[PDB]
Enzyme design. Structure first.
Site, PDB file in Angstrom:
ATOM      1  N   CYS A  44      -8.484  -4.599  86.727  1.00 33.46           N
ATOM      2  CA  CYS A  44      -7.649  -3.740  87.569  1.00 33.46           C
ATOM      3  C   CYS A  44      -6.656  -4.562  88.393  1.00 33.46           C
ATOM      4  CB  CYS A  44      -8.519  -2.905  88.519  1.00 33.46           C
ATOM      5  SG  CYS A  44      -9.511  -1.608  87.733  1.00 33.46           S
ATOM      6  N   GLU A  48      -0.742   6.421  84.432  1.00 31.83           N
ATOM      7  CA  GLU A  48      -1.424   5.355  85.165  1.00 31.83           C
ATOM      8  C   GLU A  48      -1.169   3.940  84.628  1.00 31.83           C
ATOM      9  OE1 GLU A  48      -2.470   7.642  88.069  1.00 31.83           O
ATOM     10  OE2 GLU A  48      -3.929   5.995  88.064  1.00 31.83           O
ATOM     11  N   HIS A  58      -9.943   5.531  84.385  1.00 33.33           N
ATOM     12  CA  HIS A  58      -8.920   4.825  83.613  1.00 33.33           C
ATOM     13  C   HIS A  58      -9.673   4.256  82.408  1.00 33.33           C
ATOM     14  CE1 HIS A  58      -6.533   3.927  87.546  1.00 33.33           C
ATOM     15  NE2 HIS A  58      -5.997   4.966  86.932  1.00 33.33           N
TER      16      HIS A  58
HETATM   17  N1  SUO Z   1      -7.625   0.184  88.617  1.00 33.99           N
HETATM   18  C1  SUO Z   1      -8.478   0.505  89.810  1.00 33.99           C
HETATM   19  C2  SUO Z   1      -7.698   1.338  90.826  1.00 33.99           C
HETATM   20  C3  SUO Z   1      -8.541   1.700  92.042  1.00 33.99           C
HETATM   21  C4  SUO Z   1      -7.849   2.677  93.003  1.00 33.99           C
HETATM   22  N2  SUO Z   1      -8.647   2.842  94.208  1.00 33.99           N
HETATM   23  C5  SUO Z   1      -8.125   3.381  95.302  1.00 33.99           C
HETATM   24  O1  SUO Z   1      -6.949   3.733  95.361  1.00 33.99           O
HETATM   25  C6  SUO Z   1      -9.055   3.548  96.495  1.00 33.99           C
HETATM   26  C7  SUO Z   1      -8.326   3.492  97.841  1.00 33.99           C
HETATM   27  C8  SUO Z   1      -9.197   3.962  98.999  1.00 33.99           C
HETATM   28  O2  SUO Z   1      -9.960   4.929  98.811  1.00 33.99           O
HETATM   29  O3  SUO Z   1      -9.125   3.371 100.095  1.00 33.99           O
HETATM   30  C9  SUO Z   1      -7.616   4.024  92.318  1.00 33.99           C
HETATM   31  O4  SUO Z   1      -8.422   4.968  92.536  1.00 33.99           O
HETATM   32  O5  SUO Z   1      -6.623   4.120  91.573  1.00 33.99           O
END
Ligand code: SUO
Ligand code: SUO
Ligand code: K
Ligand code: K
Lengths: 439, 439
Positions: free
Chosen positions: A363, A172, A246
């Site tokens: 983020c 990640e 994360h």
């Molecule tokens: N560093 C924060 C990342 C947030 C990201 N959210 C998303 O992808 C949500 C997208 C949605 O559900 O429409 C994740 O989970 O990796």
């Protein structure tokens, strides 16, 4: 050397699809109406405010969305619009998966190694595969193209492709990375945090551990990080099972400080002690569960804050508005502010659109330490200033809608708008034909 | 139209590394000494024997192993022989992962759709990502190149790239595929078997479900299979938890017959009933747990047998030696043989090297129904006959070792032997520069 922040410019298909199990914000706000224009402007305001305050700021562009090539890979054929129509009718869930503005969270774009920590003295960037979530795993190829278009001086920057796309190597990026030390330009101590590893039963049981130690070690290798400046630590499985998907949702580093929750890591005492004996002047600001519970950290994102260094050596905490709205958390942060430590200022920003999907200030940014020479080698067209700020706002007003829902992703107009928008943006940012639809 | 069997020629790095959790044979034989040359010969004997018996037969070559490009992608740099060394000293387990002879089990190379089942009247082949296991996921790119070099006539063959490499789309190809109907050249009913699917609580709890319904549905779309000739069915999760990692370890189809264990599928009674109503003459031959336990099923590979059609309509079961060496299973097979049904002949083969890693007769072959004209379109150099048989045996005698252990994978000599052998094989099979090292 200075630490330059590269923020993600929210794409125009920004919407809430609840695609990230383990990310409670994503899950909770599933199907709510989004505001792409507002989301983009909220992020641009934070970029500009920091840039105007003297903190080197840059931008990374959104991706091609909806991403038709992936739909073709899934068995749908015909012209782009025909594919879009076939899917909207036969498998609408795939539309959302290929129309997420998720690349905005650039903390997940790659892992950075400043030239002071590498064997060859170059700045290394390794793209994160983001294999755990399908919608995000799609990012890597384009993210790689963007990073090569931005840090395009190959004598000073080395961009490595993402690790193989398999659960064994889930990666990640920067969101699970940390760098501790004196001035940014001196060799630093890199801390890679993971959620699981083969042969280890200590792992989350409810939410997934997106990062594997195997991936982290491979990244450390790719970025040619001096083996003496590297350390791997396992995240506390209990916090991952509570929403910490994360490391940047439970801890943040900057210079000699590591601001983290009491329950952030497994074997936390041992890690802090090891860091204490290997990082001169290391200071750990540990938040006890009695003042801030894990549940409160996840809903407020106080640890997904940006810990910046001012010229006096004092620090400023960049926080999302939710931290000011939660009595207990705002109270603690102010105790921290008044307390005798490097933190001497709190700065709050409204990033509601991003937070609704589980992404806060941190983020939305990727930290890259660059020497004066390396800074000049960066595509100057992406560095934030009045001219870029105004151009990007005008661009957003021209192409972004102030309302979007999953149903709108089937609109061939949205598709058309997005292509033209990215065409113009690649021109504005001097990136060239970096997007697939442009080749 | 005839059903042609394409078998995998075992690679020179065949070894036991216990890399497949859920495949009990693989796990049981971890680190045992292997015999590459013998493994190759055993397989060729089966190919040649079936060919002589009148069953159209062909061959698919092994891949480049050790696969150095993947090690570099993992962070190990330098010349080929330097990487090999560094890996052996720093992380030798990766060596096995990039040196597996797993592509030999071509039942997992791709999913096939004969021209009588497709919307555009062509033969369709979609490569399997084999995403569940890292060492096998590495196969797809080369498998696609090999398939395109064999089924090169694009007016008759359509090879599609593997699905995106994510767990949501785990695909193991033909091993989870089935085709029922009258004669091979007639439109048939394709039965796709999967282990799990999003939103479904029914799933294995011990061993992984490598095949997802999402992937199955995506391949059916890619192969342009007539929607009225497709059926999806879930594997009984309890049997997966006992070692049935692929459908071909618990069931096998041919013409109107479906030879399966009573515990093969979920809602099995209803599935068979649906087949009886939609497939004229369909005949299910169910083996009850009383006659053969699931444990004995997985240990002998009774269902990983090849069910072949004899010129008079009767059928023959091609089994691995373990079936004859297990008193109980051999007893059942003989009862089945005697009883009035299509099974009128049993044929056994010593495939001990393949079986030790969980691969039986069926695992080593990929069924491809081809019309006379399509058959003529296949690369002639891969069809089995005396010339090719004797040529491959000499080739094996010249480049294959008689013993191999994980520790030997670090030998730069092994790397050279393999590169040279494949280079020579590409010419013999008239495949041009098909491997990465040749490009
Ligand atoms: N560093 C924060 C990342 C947030 C990201 N959210 C998303 O992808 C949500 C997208 C949605 O559900 O429409 C994740 O989970 O990796
Ligand atoms: N259709 C049967 C294939 C068997 C194969 N075995 C393996 O890859 C084991 C290799 C080893 O562990 O050395 C598998 O698990 O897919
Ligand atoms: K303070
Ligand atoms: K019989």
């Amino acid at each position: 050397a200075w630490e330059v922040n590269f923020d993600g410019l929210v794409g125009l298909t920004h919407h809430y699809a609840g695609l990230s199990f383990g990310n409670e914000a994503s899950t909770r706000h599933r199907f709510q109406v989004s505001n792409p224009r507002l989301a983009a402007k909220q992020g641009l305001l934070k970029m500009k405010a920091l840039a105007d305050a003297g903190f080197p700021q840059a931008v990374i562009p959104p991706h091609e969305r909806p991403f038709i090539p992936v739909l073709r890979q899934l068995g749908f054929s015909g012209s782009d619009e025909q594919v879009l129509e076939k899917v909207a009718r036969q498998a609408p869930h795939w539309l959302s998966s290929v129309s997420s503005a998720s690349p905005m969270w650039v903390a997940n774009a790659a892992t950075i190694a400043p030239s002071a920590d590498t064997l060859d003295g170059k700045v290394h960037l390794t793209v994160a595969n983001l294999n755990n979530k399908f919608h995000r795993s799609l990012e890597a190829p384009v993210t790689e193209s963007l990073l090569k278009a931005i840090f395009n001086d190959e004598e000073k920057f080395s961009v490595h492709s993402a690790l193989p796309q398999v659960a064994l190597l889930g990666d990640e990026g920067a969101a699970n990375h940390n760098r501790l030390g004196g001035h940014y330009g001196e060799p630093g101590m890199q801390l890679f945090v993971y959620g699981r590893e083969e042969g280890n039963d200590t792992r989350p049981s409810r939410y997934p551990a997106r990062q594997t130690r195997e991936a982290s070690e491979a990244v450390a290798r790719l970025n040619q990080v001096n083996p003496q400046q590297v350390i791997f630590a396992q995240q506390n499985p209990d916090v991952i099972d509570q929403g910490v998907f994360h490391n940047d949702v439970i801890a943040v580093s900057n210079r000699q400080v590591l601001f983290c929750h009491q329950q952030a890591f497994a074997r936390q005492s041992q890690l802090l002690a090891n860091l204490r004996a290997r990082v001169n002047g290391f200071m750990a600001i540990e938040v006890p569960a009695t003042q801030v519970s894990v549940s409160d950290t996840v809903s407020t994102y106080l640890f997904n804050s940006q810990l910046l260094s001012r010229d006096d050596g004092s620090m400023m905490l960049v926080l999302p508005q939710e931290c000011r709205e939660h009595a207990g958390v705002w109270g603690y942060l102010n105790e921290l502010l008044a307390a005798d430590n490097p933190i001497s200022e709190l700065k709050v920003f409204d990033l509601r659109e991003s937070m609704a999907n589980g992404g806060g200030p941190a983020c939305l940014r990727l930290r890259v330490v660059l020497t004066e020479e390396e800074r000049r080698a960066v595509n100057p067209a992406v560095m934030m200033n009045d001219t870029l700020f105004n151009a990007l706002n005008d661009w957003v007003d021209r192409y972004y809608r102030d309302r979007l829902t999953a149903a709108d992703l089937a609109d061939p107009q949205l598709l058309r708008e997005g292509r033209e928008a990215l065409d113009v943006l690649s021109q504005l940012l001097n990136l060239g034909s970096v997007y697939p639809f442009q080749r």
